[model samples]
Target: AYAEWIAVKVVVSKSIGTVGIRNATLQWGKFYRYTNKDDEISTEEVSSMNVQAGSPQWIASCGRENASSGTQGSFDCYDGNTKMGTFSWDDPWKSGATNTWSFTPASADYAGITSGGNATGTDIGEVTLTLGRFSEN
Candidate 1:
């Protein structure tokens, strides 16, 4: 079982921007929860976090379909480069908008990009994978 609600925040050495927009894409990767035991780790959720893109022009579909491109770039979720799926913004940024997109790991070994991946891969700056859950889930 898990909590019904979630919240997220990350700080990078530099700002993030892909597609020429500052902080264009939100973080995308695996997540984890800390336990009383130092060695114990539990998987939480796999998600694509970001503000909505192209809101007025495009709309997010019911499923995990991508919305239109906007100030924030789209996100492509993955399982160690296996290429899981693509998620895009639902709308543009709003004053009180606290948006998050989430999913369950399709396979075990789902983890966020820690090393060996370049940040410049997309227009956005290098993505410094902060912390995430280790999933054999």
Candidate 2:
């Protein structure tokens, strides 16, 4: 057993779709291996999470499950009070936990795109995440 920690980074890409009523549809990709400092590649499923929509004002907080067994978490997307949807991890290692979601405007005033399709938006983007991992000693 050793007393050490590993660093895990989650990179996400964001693509802005066409403008819609209140909100624009967005998509998030998978987490990439940025730094291999510790050289501890995660073989286990990292799990999927829901990332909230980052507005021009404040930053949204995404959600995740405690364990990768079975459970979904939600993020603050609508930039409102409640969550948008439950992002679950079907296969982080293979299929990945979460993919992307679509958001409609609150007042329906034409904010972004018209279609909330899967990875079909003309604008594509990403987001990376960094986390620490500790093993039992």
Candidate 3:
């Protein structure tokens, strides 16, 4: 069996205003040790566009629900075409944060990766985007 833990992170950046925020894209990467070959490693990416502000989005492997290849993994998020931030954790959800989004792992562990952002059309300074992830048990 593999380690009962996974690492995940997110990065996001926006253009200038609500327009850029509305069209922002979220990208995530997951890296983990191969189940059968502990010495080997595997990786995958999940990308989604048109994510609305204040709307939480879930990112994971396509076959994570049934495939045993999502454990001990790491992920990151992006906004539009720029990277915002990244993180890696074992049980960030256990912190009891209200905004945390949890997902079960098909392998030996799970990662609660969730992200959201917002923009105001009237605020014309810069389309600054506040993006990050939270977790809960």
Candidate 4:
């Protein structure tokens, strides 16, 4: 089995659009207990983006399982803690396992709007994630 702690890293970006472009945000769904395990996955919120032109931001966080099993964990974005999505992976991750997850405005509501309002044209953006378990023992 693996440690109860998981390390998560996310990369967020937005596509070039109108002048009124605003920051974009993306959230992640529950992390779950790595499946077939009895550790409460930790939860957190992360996001990134730039309206004008385009930009990418990096985010990271640590979460602790609830000490139980059969429950999923959640990672979201912004203050609203909006639910972005969920990912499924093998249980008892390997020592150097690097899990990857991706997100977009069309995928999660937390992304909000990349363009429009003061800005014109269509808005585009996406969120990329990298997750792994770290031993604390």
Candidate 5:
């Protein structure tokens, strides 16, 4: 038995004049807990990096789907190969996880490009991964 593999990402909103707000690269990770004979817990979360492109506006998304591995996963959208800007999310399933129960990353549980993502430095925009559904197979 195992936890579900859920999807998580970023999205941008459509506002007519706002097509592509920026260009960026996304990098992510799926973390797992591996226990050895010694009972030593090895926490490893390999990263998956993305390319730089237009930051789609008017409600769109980028990055990977099913981004979590049993225990954890996260993605950070960069402002063109830069810091974790535009929007950053790093959450996990530490509780309430059943093999059949799917979980979705919370929108409130995220870090948006506060006072940024918009170079105008006075607009509010969130990270645009857009969808993360807890699915079963």
Candidate 6:
């Protein structure tokens, strides 16, 4: 039962695509972790909507669900208000909770690519994330 509120140090890289991002929004949900009887607990979503293309090491808040069945949590990337970019997680999270960083790819014209009408703007750069782990042996 070691649930603690920890600080998360985030570092976002530049976009790999031709275009860069502006006024990015970072969805840092599950800012805290605890337990409940029914196990339907949720936390406040920490969001940032002023990050630039080369935002430096920023700070956020979040915790881990150490309990075996505390509550399911999720994380992802999106820089706009809503629906500006495609999601990656599919299950409980968005588009499979795919990318784990504040930096994400900009939504380019999908049909402008050579793929089969399914072009993916996978040019997002590598984002740095540092925090404490809940896994214990």
Best by TM-score: 3
* Model 3: how far residue 24 lies from native, Å: 17
In the range 1-137, model 4's lDDT, one tens digit per residue, is: 12322332243333212112123222322333333234433332221322122333332221223322211123333222323334222212233433333333324233332211111111111223422112234
Report the lDDT tens digits of candidate 5 across residue range 1-137.
Answer: 02222222234322111112232222332222221112221222112333322343222222123433322223344333333333333323334332221123234322232221322211112323432222244
User: Per-residue lDDT tens digits of candidate 1, residues 28-99?
Assistant: 221222211112221221233332222211111111113222123234444333543333322222233433
Better of 5 and 6 by TM-score: 6
Candidate 4 TM-score to native: 0.25
Please identify model 2 stretches exceeding 4 Å from their true place: 1-55, 69-98, 106-108, 113-137
Error of 2 at 93 (Å): 9.0
* Ranking of all candidate structures by their TM-score, best first: 3, 6, 5, 4, 1, 2
TM-score, one value per model:
0.23, 0.22, 0.28, 0.25, 0.26, 0.27
Candidate 4, residue 11: lDDT: 31
Query: 20-112, model 6: which lDDT tens digit per residue?
Result: 122322233233312222232233223332334444332222222443211122233343333223212111222222222222223431211
The Cα RMSD in angstroms, rounded to one decimal, for candidate 2 relative to the true structure is 16.2
* Winner on TM-score (1 vs 3): 3
Per-residue alpha-carbon lDDT of candidate 2 for residues 70-131, written as tens digits (9 for 90 to 100): 21122222222422222212112123334343323334322322222223322112222211
Give the CA lDDT, 0 to 100, for residue 59 in model 4: 28
Minimal lDDT window, size 10, model 6: 109-118
Model 3 residue runs over 4 Å out of place are 1-45, 60-70, 91-137
Error of 6 at 52 (Å): 3.9
| lDDT agreement with native, every candidate | 0.26, 0.23, 0.28, 0.27, 0.27, 0.26
Model 2, position 111, has a per-residue lDDT of 30
Error of 3 at 70 (Å): 7.6
lDDT of 3 by residue, 29-62 (tens): 2322322223333342232223444442332211
